[PDB]
Structure formats: structure tokens, C-alpha cells
Ligand binder design. Structure first.
Ligand SMILES: Nc1ncnc2c1ncn2[C@@H]1O[C@H](COP(=O)(O)OP(=O)(O)OC[C@H]2O[C@H](O)[C@H](O)[C@@H]2O)[C@@H](O)[C@H]1O
Ligand SMILES: c1cncc([C@H]2Nc3ccccc3-n3cccc32)c1
Ligand SMILES: [Zn+2]
Length: 282
């Protein structure tokens, strides 16, 4: 708990130079066009551009602790806005280019961006979400739930119940939520393309799910500034800022990144929207 293994922290960042970065984001578009079933896997790195530090980056939570220094937030969790990345993911799901989204983040931003909860696995929990110990019903709150480690928050269930409401933030010894992990695993096994964004892939089983795609000949793409644990298994590794990678990708796909309306919760995915026709890939 005080000696939980925090993995490798503070590894040097890598930056693909611009022409190589272009070429790789073109190839990623190519793969997205060719695939039947795309699964995205996100970590802390997709929220750094909103002011939330990561864990293992050069100024990440664990990295700074290791050095005796403090992480820095440039926002609260409540005032944080979804990044260009987050909103790109919303659009890709709406046009049917994303089958499923697996996230390690507890920051609540995928939910608050309006991404549909039924195509999202929140493997490590959500700091805005509490859960009734009796009936399992979830409340998505507008402010962060004050506790971590699956503790009673002090509120009760109002289902047509009075069960104890508890946080959904897993501690080190807590096993992952069964529903989310089973769905994430199914999705990753059935995918022909897994794309990891802003994760170092060091936590298991979370960080191992993208490798399940390699199973039936799927492709694996890794987008990350640092090395990751599974770099050697990637078909493509793109070393650059995830917002620059995603904006370029959307531009190749002919998709706009949509406007955020402010915090919103979407339980169930809407009907799919029209999308550009596909290029000929010779
Ligand atoms: N703008 C960016 N663009 C690209 N990559 C980025 C950017 N910002 C950061 N990175 C990369 O983003 C990566 C983030 O890696 P880590 O910080 O391990 O986060 P995790 O989500 O995999 O942590 C897993 C769990 O572990 C914790 O204990 C919690 O439980 C987490 O849920 C780095 O490798 C950065 O170089
Ligand atoms: C996601 C990214 N950076 C930091 C966090 C941590 N923020 C935080 C800040 C203060 C108290 C407790 C927490 N916390 C609990 C789980 C993860 C966090 C989450
Ligand atoms: Zn209940």
C-alpha cells in the first residue's frame, strides 16, 4: 500500500520528427479505414492537456513522489474540460468507427464528454460515480465523490432501497469491476485494431488487454510520449502529443471534432451518424 509497486516512472519522452509523425498518422488512418472493429484504450496521458497530471510521466504523480516533489493540477476535477482527444473519441463512436472504449482513468472525463456509458469500460472507477452496495445502481454525480477504496460515502440509495452508497475508486488490493473487465476483454479479443492512447501499459490486467487483439491477427497501435510496456508488440508506435495525433487523424478521416456542451451523461449510445466514404486503399 505504501510499498505498492508503482512500476517504471519518469522514463525519457520520445518525439517523432514531423515528417515521420505525418507518415505514421497517415498509416493509422489507413488502419482505421481497413478495420472491422476498432477498440481504443486510454490512460492518464489523454488528460494532461486539460491540467490533470499523469502517474508516470516526467511530472507525473508517482514520478514526483519518487523525487520528493508534488504533482501539480492546473484544474479541479470539476472544472476540467475534455481534451480534443476526448471529443475526438465521442465523434468516432457516433460515426461507428469505434466499437468500444477501455479506460484506466478515474477523472470522469469520458463520461462528462457525453461518451456513451454502454460502450465504455471504466476499469479503475470514476471519481464522480458512486454505487449502491445493495442493488448495484450507479449515481453519476456532478461533483467528485469524497472517498476512495470502495468506502461508504454517507449517502443512501433512492431507487423505488436505502442501500449504502460507496465510491468506485479501486485501491491497490481491489479487483477490477467484473462487468467492465469482462466487456473490455470481449471487445479487445474481438477487435482487429486496438489503439492505445496516453497509457504506459504497466498495470495488469488493464495494460494487457490491447495484446488480446494480437490474437487472431489483430493490429496494435500505441500512441505515447514515453516507452510503454508492450512496445515490442505494436504494429505502429507513434511518439507525439495525443491531441496533435488525434486532430491529424480526424482531418484524414474527414471528421470534425465536436463541441462540448458542458458536463452531460449519456447512458446509451445514439444511432450512428453518416460518415465519409472510405478511400481506396491499394
Ligand atoms: N499529451 C500526451 N500525449 C501523449 N502521451 C502522453 C501525453 N501526456 C502524457 N503522456 C504519456 O501518457 C502515459 C501515461 O502513463 P501513466 O502515467 O502510467 O498512466 P496509466 O493510465 O497507464 O496508469 C495506469 C494506472 O496506474 C496508476 O497507478 C493509476 O491507477 C492508473 O489508472 C505516459 O507514459 C506519458 O508519457
Ligand atoms: C487521475 C490523475 N491524476 C491524479 C489522480 C489522483 N487525484 C487525487 C487527488 C487528491 C486525492 C486523491 C486523488 N486520487 C485518487 C485516485 C486517483 C487520484 C487521478
Ligand atoms: Zn440501491
Amino acid at each position: 500500500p505504501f510499498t505498492a509497486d508503482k512500476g517504471k516512472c519518469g522514463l525519457p519522452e520520445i518525439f517523432d520528427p514531423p515528417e515521420e509523425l505525418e507518415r505514421k498518422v497517415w498509416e493509422l488512418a489507413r488502419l482505421v479505414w481497413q478495420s472491422s472493429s476498432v477498440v481504443f484504450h486510454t490512460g492518464a496521458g489523454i488528460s494532461t492537456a486539460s491540467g490533470i497530471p499523469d502517474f508516470r510521466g516526467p511530472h507525473g504523480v508517482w514520478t514526483m513522489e519518487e523525487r520528493g516533489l508534488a504533482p501539480k493540477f492546473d484544474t479541479t476535477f470539476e472544472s476540467a474540460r475534455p481534451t480534443q482527444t476526448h471529443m475526438a473519441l465521442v465523434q468516432l463512436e457516433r460515426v461507428g468507427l469505434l466499437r468500444f472504449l477501455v479506460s484506466q482513468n478515474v477523472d470522469g472525463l469520458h463520461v462528462r464528454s457525453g461518451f456513451p456509458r454502454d460502450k465504455l469500460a471504466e476499469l479503475h472507477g470514476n471519481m464522480f460515480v458512486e454505487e449502491c452496495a445493495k442493488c448495484k445502481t450507479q449515481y453519476v454525480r456532478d461533483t467528485v465523490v469524497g472517498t476512495m477504496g470502495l468506502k461508504a460515502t454517507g449517502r443512501l440509495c433512492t431507487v423505488a432501497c436505502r442501500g449504502e452508497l460507496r465510491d468506485t475508486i479501486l485501491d491497490w488490493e481491489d479487483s477490477l469491476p467484473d462487468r467492465d473487465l469482462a466487456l473490455a476483454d470481449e471487445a479487445s479479443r474481438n477487435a482487429d485494431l486496438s489503439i492505445t492512447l496516453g497509457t504506459s501499459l504497466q498495470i495488469r490486467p488493464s495494460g494487457n488487454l490491447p495484446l488480446a487483439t494480437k490474437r487472431r491477427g489483430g493490429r496494435l497501435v500505441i500512441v505515447n510520449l514515453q516507452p510503454t510496456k508492450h512496445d515490442r508488440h505494436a504494429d505502429l508506435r507513434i511518439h507525439g502529443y495525443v491531441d496533435e495525433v488525434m486532430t491529424r487523424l480526424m482531418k484524414h478521416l474527414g471528421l470534425e471534432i465536436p463541441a462540448w456542451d458542458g458536463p452531460r451523461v449519456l447512458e446509451r449510445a445514439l444511432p450512428p451518424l453518416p460518415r465519409p466514404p472510405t478511400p481506396k486503399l491499394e
